[PDB]
Design an enzyme around this catalytic site. Sequence first.
Site, mmCIF file in Angstrom:
data_model
loop_
_atom_site.group_PDB
_atom_site.id
_atom_site.type_symbol
_atom_site.label_atom_id
_atom_site.label_comp_id
_atom_site.label_asym_id
_atom_site.label_seq_id
_atom_site.Cartn_x
_atom_site.Cartn_y
_atom_site.Cartn_z
ATOM 1 N N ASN A 1 0.705 -1.178 0.093
ATOM 2 C CA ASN A 1 -0.039 0.044 -0.050
ATOM 3 C C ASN A 1 0.921 1.269 0.060
ATOM 4 O O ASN A 1 0.495 2.183 -0.889
ATOM 5 C CB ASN A 1 -1.150 0.013 1.231
ATOM 6 C CG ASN A 1 -1.777 1.376 1.156
ATOM 7 O OD1 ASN A 1 -2.860 1.572 0.553
ATOM 8 N ND2 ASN A 1 -1.318 2.250 1.996
ATOM 9 N N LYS B 1 0.445 8.847 1.640
ATOM 10 C CA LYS B 1 -1.018 8.543 2.159
ATOM 11 C C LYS B 1 -1.560 9.995 2.567
ATOM 12 O O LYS B 1 -1.444 10.382 3.714
ATOM 13 C CB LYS B 1 -1.176 7.408 3.385
ATOM 14 C CG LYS B 1 -0.344 6.260 3.195
ATOM 15 C CD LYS B 1 -0.569 5.727 1.796
ATOM 16 C CE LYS B 1 -2.067 5.106 1.500
ATOM 17 N NZ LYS B 1 -2.473 4.778 0.163
ATOM 18 N N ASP C 1 -3.241 0.056 5.938
ATOM 19 C CA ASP C 1 -3.995 -1.071 5.637
ATOM 20 C C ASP C 1 -3.517 -2.184 6.072
ATOM 21 O O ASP C 1 -3.477 -3.428 5.326
ATOM 22 C CB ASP C 1 -4.037 -1.077 4.019
ATOM 23 C CG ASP C 1 -4.953 -0.142 3.252
ATOM 24 O OD1 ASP C 1 -5.417 0.753 4.075
ATOM 25 O OD2 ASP C 1 -5.115 -0.229 1.860
#
Lengths: 255, 257, 255, 257
Positions: free
Chosen positions: B10, B45, B226
């Site tokens: 991720n 992110k 995640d």
Amino acid sequence: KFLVIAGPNAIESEELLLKVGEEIKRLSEKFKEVEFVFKSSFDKANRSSIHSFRGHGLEYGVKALRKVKEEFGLKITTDIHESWQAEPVAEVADIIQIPAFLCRQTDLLLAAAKTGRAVNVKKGQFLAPWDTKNVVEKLKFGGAKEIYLTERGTTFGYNNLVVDFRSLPIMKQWAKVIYDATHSVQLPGGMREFIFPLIRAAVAVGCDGVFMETHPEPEKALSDASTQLPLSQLEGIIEAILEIREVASKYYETI
Amino acid sequence: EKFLVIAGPNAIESEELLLKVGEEIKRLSEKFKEVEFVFKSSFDKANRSSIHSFRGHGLEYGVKALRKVKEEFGLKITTDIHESWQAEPVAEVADIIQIPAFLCRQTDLLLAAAKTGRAVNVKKGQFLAPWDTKNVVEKLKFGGAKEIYLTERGTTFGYNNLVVDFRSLPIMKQWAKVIYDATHSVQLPGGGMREFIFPLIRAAVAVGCDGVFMETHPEPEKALSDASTQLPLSQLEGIIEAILEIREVASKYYETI
Amino acid sequence: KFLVIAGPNAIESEELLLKVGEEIKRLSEKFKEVEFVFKSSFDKANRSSIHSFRGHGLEYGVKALRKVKEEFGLKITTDIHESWQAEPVAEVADIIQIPAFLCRQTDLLLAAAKTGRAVNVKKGQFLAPWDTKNVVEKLKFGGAKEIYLTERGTTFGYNNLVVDFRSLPIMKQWAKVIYDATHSVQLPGGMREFIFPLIRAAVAVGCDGVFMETHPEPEKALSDASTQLPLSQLEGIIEAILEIREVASKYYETI
Amino acid sequence: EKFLVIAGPNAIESEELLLKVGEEIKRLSEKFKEVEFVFKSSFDKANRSSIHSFRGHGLEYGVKALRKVKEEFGLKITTDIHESWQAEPVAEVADIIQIPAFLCRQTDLLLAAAKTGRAVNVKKGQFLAPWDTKNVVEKLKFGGAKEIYLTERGTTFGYNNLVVDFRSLPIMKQWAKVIYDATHSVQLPGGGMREFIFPLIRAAVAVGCDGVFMETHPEPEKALSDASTQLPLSQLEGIIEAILEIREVASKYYETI
């Protein structure tokens, strides 16, 4: 074995049932790896409009269904709407079906269980997958031994339903699971184009059977006309689900 | 048509992590020759729920790490952008520019990605209906995009939950190639359930899609993002084989758009 | 004091802003018990269609908004879409607004907070009421001291939004709460007939302010034409909310 | 028009419980003369989630207890029916026959209620859209109902949660009198939050409705049903006063249907 519940939505006439029963009987002989169950409602007790087709009554319906079982040797299933109907219906129905809106009516479930027949409960559009554990418990308390839970969509905003495929593995923890390919795509208050694709999803995910309504001339159906499958297309879809199940079953998770 | 598999950690936790996953993706690309692999990892992110959560090591570091993956393994690359200015630098290494779900309606971000000449993959917003993506594709085409993908990653279903309406696959296929995000679709927003990743991916391929997006990590439990939904790297091979098998058997039944 | 954020959805022209600013200025003098804040977007950065109206740019927009503040002495608020815009916008905006789709973009929130101005975050249609606690925490970390959270509807199925009024008391635990009476009734991808009724609900439940878009000729609006309120109707609605608030406030629950 | 307040203990736990609540409702009816009070209590909870939960003491016992409330206090009565055969016996004591939310589409149940000549109040199903109730009213009118109410009690919003879309009040008012169920609207199906009962009831009256339905019990914590949402009997008076005040001040703004 894999269960295929099929038939015309409503008992428009015993004649209609016989025509559909003939084809289902044929497929029955062609696909021995499948247990076919003929379905048709003797009454549409929950229509939106007072002016819509309901049916010809319980007596006429049980008679026509009895004719199908005797003439084709096919198992039968129909739904009940009030407790008193369970007994007379059980005379012919191998599987008593409980309507989605009525999946929480204790007396209806107990009345169905008391007949000794198998019971298939349509999961209410308002129910969560885990909420079905209690439904099964009611049926067991009532003496039912063969219990099915049918996925038929969940309320998603207004006049729309969504199929949360996570429900299949969840419900499998306490009952056999059936996927209703017809009502799942209907828009309350649908699109036939999504019936096949979603049924492929159901078998890829893993279920114990599929429920599909079929009619010789869907356009002329007095109920679910927009979503009933043309009889001639039934064979192809069944073969497709068997092929997909054969391959995908290798990956179905345990319990 | 060659099936697309977009996979990777991720977030770019480190260049070493990327190389570890990259090595495995490379091995698999040699085995599954009928699959087009694209290595994915976010350099940032930019939408974490908490200000205290891991974001990343910056665009510069991230692009450099992704470039190393492409150079050492010859794998295609994809990463997401968060503001218009990032399109140009990212396009230097990314074969596919990813547009975040929450930003799928931000015109300038889509336009910035489209003018780079790179492929663009838009995550379908949790608030968007399947038919609402037609205008998303139109914006991209208007901006010069010639290779466009729409990724299904769940829809808001009550609070802290997402549902996957598989009817979206055939609907979106009308105007773009469709990818199914097997990882984010089972996450519980602001709450994920790893036990549903495989079954839902089976559903996607049975319905029919042009590729799958799956995040994988050597040790998911230690992922900085995640952690509840990233797939253990060792399980990737089996999942890919399974989807190719289900795709093959279901393929003759895929409807023509 | 009670906050009323009003103005035309988009800066169609500084002329339009002046006409609306004139009326808002008048109401400002008539209702001293209310703090009016003039709102208008210099850019519609999230239109569904590439062919829809966006605006005349940030410079033209900040200029027109500056004109309103100087000519009427009204506080200003407009929304930003990328981090770099916070600084130039803060030159005129007393309250920097964060778009619903962008309520989770950390850098945008921090950029807004860094300006020293108040920040009003539109609650994403994908967010739960309790999920806004983290949004506020980001803003506080960024140095913001005056923070608002605006209720503007939640995704309810496709192309529809629902207002869960439980959100008002929940969000009030960590920020001042504003009810967006315009976007809450818009159908994504609305009905003006529900604007007034829902705004009455908002004040009966209890909020710190109301956000309402108004336009001299809504039918001619280049954005939100279906939901912008005719300028002439603004006075009546404001008086109504003040009256309802006066009575209902006696029952607003503590924190 | 006289405002309707339907209140009472969710279930007929005992005739004594009914008389205790009835006494208070009677006192309040003498004070709030502008309000039409209707005493509510179910003789059977035919839809409990669990087979182990309290259902009731039967129709016979229940009707007898309700008749005692009407006789001792002169209060109107309402209770719900679950199957067609119950309409006749229940109509002997019930001024308003209530149709359960899950059963709002069951034609025979609606018809059975309508032919009794009594008023009928249908709880709007959690699966029904506001405009879908037009056909519900049509069925009742077809069956002879002359006094019809539609009760808003929340809509399915994800799993184990209900949301109240207040747009439903003005929409349903197009074809029937509208009641807002302040108790069931905040319950969490198969999960209720008492802290939201009062605020949402304030919302209902500000939007505009023809009455409110609120379950009340001397000691909610000991209720055999809806223990998380029944209002303490001592709080009823204050809530009713509050809704009359908000209704009065908001009334001049109620839109004409």
